[PDB]
Design an enzyme around this catalytic site. Structure first.
Site, short mmCIF file in Angstrom:
data_model
loop_
_atom_site.label_atom_id
_atom_site.label_comp_id
_atom_site.label_asym_id
_atom_site.label_seq_id
_atom_site.Cartn_x
_atom_site.Cartn_y
_atom_site.Cartn_z
N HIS A 40 0.82 -1.23 0.00
CA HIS A 40 0.00 0.00 0.00
C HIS A 40 0.86 1.29 0.00
O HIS A 40 0.31 2.38 -0.02
CB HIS A 40 -1.00 -0.03 1.20
CG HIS A 40 -0.54 0.41 2.60
ND1 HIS A 40 -0.18 -0.36 3.59
CD2 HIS A 40 -0.46 1.71 3.06
CE1 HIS A 40 0.12 0.40 4.62
NE2 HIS A 40 -0.05 1.67 4.31
N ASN A 54 18.17 12.15 10.79
CA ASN A 54 17.29 13.35 10.67
C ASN A 54 16.95 13.35 9.18
O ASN A 54 17.83 13.55 8.36
CB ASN A 54 18.05 14.61 11.00
CG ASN A 54 17.14 15.85 10.94
OD1 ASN A 54 16.25 15.97 10.12
ND2 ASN A 54 17.32 16.81 11.78
N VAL A 57 17.76 16.87 7.32
CA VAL A 57 19.15 17.41 7.33
C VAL A 57 20.13 16.43 6.76
O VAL A 57 20.15 15.30 7.18
CB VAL A 57 19.61 17.72 8.78
CG1 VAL A 57 21.09 18.14 8.81
CG2 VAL A 57 18.75 18.86 9.34
N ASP A 84 0.08 -7.62 1.90
CA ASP A 84 0.59 -6.20 1.84
C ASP A 84 2.15 -6.18 1.90
O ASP A 84 2.76 -5.86 2.90
CB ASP A 84 0.05 -5.46 3.01
CG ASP A 84 0.26 -3.93 2.84
OD1 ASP A 84 0.61 -3.44 1.78
OD2 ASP A 84 0.04 -3.23 3.81
N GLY A 175 3.02 6.57 8.38
CA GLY A 175 4.39 7.12 8.17
C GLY A 175 5.38 6.04 8.53
O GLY A 175 6.47 6.00 8.00
N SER A 177 4.47 3.02 8.18
CA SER A 177 3.93 2.09 7.14
C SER A 177 5.06 1.55 6.26
O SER A 177 5.88 2.37 5.87
CB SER A 177 2.95 2.88 6.25
OG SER A 177 2.15 3.65 7.15
N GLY A 178 5.13 0.27 5.99
CA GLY A 178 6.18 -0.33 5.14
C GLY A 178 7.46 -0.67 5.88
O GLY A 178 8.27 -1.44 5.39
N1 LIG Z 1 -0.10 0.42 14.51
C1 LIG Z 1 -1.16 0.98 13.98
N2 LIG Z 1 -2.25 1.24 14.68
C2 LIG Z 1 -1.06 1.30 12.62
C3 LIG Z 1 -1.64 2.48 12.13
C4 LIG Z 1 -1.48 2.78 10.78
C5 LIG Z 1 -1.94 3.83 10.05
C6 LIG Z 1 -1.50 3.62 8.75
C7 LIG Z 1 -1.76 4.46 7.65
C8 LIG Z 1 -2.69 5.51 7.74
C9 LIG Z 1 -2.94 6.34 6.64
C10 LIG Z 1 -2.26 6.14 5.44
C11 LIG Z 1 -1.33 5.11 5.32
O1 LIG Z 1 -0.62 4.89 4.15
C12 LIG Z 1 -0.59 5.80 3.05
C13 LIG Z 1 0.55 6.81 3.19
C14 LIG Z 1 1.59 6.46 2.17
C15 LIG Z 1 0.96 5.49 1.23
C16 LIG Z 1 -0.27 4.91 1.88
C17 LIG Z 1 -1.07 4.26 6.42
O2 LIG Z 1 -0.15 3.23 6.27
N3 LIG Z 1 -0.81 2.50 8.73
C18 LIG Z 1 -0.81 1.96 9.92
C19 LIG Z 1 -0.20 0.81 10.37
C20 LIG Z 1 -0.33 0.46 11.73
CL1 LIG Z 1 0.45 -1.10 12.09
CA LIG Z 2 19.45 13.29 6.97
#
Ligand SMILES: NC(=[NH2+])c1cc2cc(-c3cccc(OC4CCCC4)c3[O-])[nH]c2cc1Cl
Ligand SMILES: [Ca+2]
Length: 223
Positions: A40, A54, A57, A84, A175, A177-178
């Protein structure tokens, strides 16, 4: 990461930041030319940033390499987030050293109670957005499948596992994520989804990497 701590510069050498003009997802370096992240997080125009602490920076140790191709799992379902996982091939190989190193893939799946390290530059607030400049870390245990299924009834497949704290307060978030879930030096999970961040009884759900090791190996071998 909500309720976590500052990792310390370059103490998580396999952690990468996927950047398209800003940090949007994490990933894990598994060899000098490949990274594993979540399906995703896919988008075109990805620049992989290695050796970062950072992300706003240039401090030294950074290597910015463009992705040559991203391979989303063929059975990825964006509605359930089952499968995923995505592999990104780098345009050139990274120079590994103590600050940029790969993490090993597992030979067996981990058990409930195993403590793991989750890291990332994701949101640090459960109610609101606060993104950090440096890398945050959280130590969290893998939960049992009954607790996971009781928290997300009907939404957990065999390619997912839950990790975290049911009391709330400490968790991964958007954030992150991945990014990596490392247990005993092996990459066991990928930050995938959850209901909110650090909410009581709503742990994070992670892609169960041990179920994809032959897929990763065969795909890398043929690309
Ligand atoms: N530990 C948690 N409760 C949790 C919360 C979120 C929330 C996200 C998430 C929320 C909004 C957008 C996302 O991806 C988009 C941003 C970049 C591409 C897809 C998320 O992965 N992923 C998550 C993964 C986890 Cl494991
Ligand atoms: Ca840096």
């Amino acid at each position: 990461i909500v309720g976590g701590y500052t990792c310390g510069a370059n103490t998580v050498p396999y952690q990468v930041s996927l950047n398209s003009g800003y940090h949007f997802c994490g990933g894990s370096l598994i060899n000098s030319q490949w990274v594993v992240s979540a399906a995703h997080c896919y988008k075109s125009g990805i620049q992989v940033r290695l050796g970062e602490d950072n992300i706003n920076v240039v401090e030294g140790n950074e290597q910015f390499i463009s992705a040559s191709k991203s391979i989303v799992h063929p059975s990825y379902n964006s509605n359930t987030l089952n499968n995923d996982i995505m592999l990104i091939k780098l345009k050139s190989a990274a120079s590994l050293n103590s600050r940029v190193a790969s993490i090993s893939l597992p030979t067996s799946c981990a058990s409930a109670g195993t403590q793991c390290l989750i890291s990332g530059w994701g949101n640090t607030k459960s109610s609101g957005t606060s993104y950090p400049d440096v890398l945050k870390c959280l130590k969290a245990p893998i939960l049992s499948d009954s607790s996971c299924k009781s928290a997300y009834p009907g939404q957990i497949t065999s390619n997912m596992f839950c990790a975290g704290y049911l009391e709330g307060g400490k968790d991964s978030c958007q954030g992150d994520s991945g990014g990596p879930v490392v247990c005993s030096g092996k990459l066991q999970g990928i930050v995938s989804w959850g209901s909110g961040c650090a909410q009581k009884n709503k742990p994070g759900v992670y892609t169960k990497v041990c179920n994809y090791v032959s897929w990763i190996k065969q795909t890398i071998a043929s690309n």
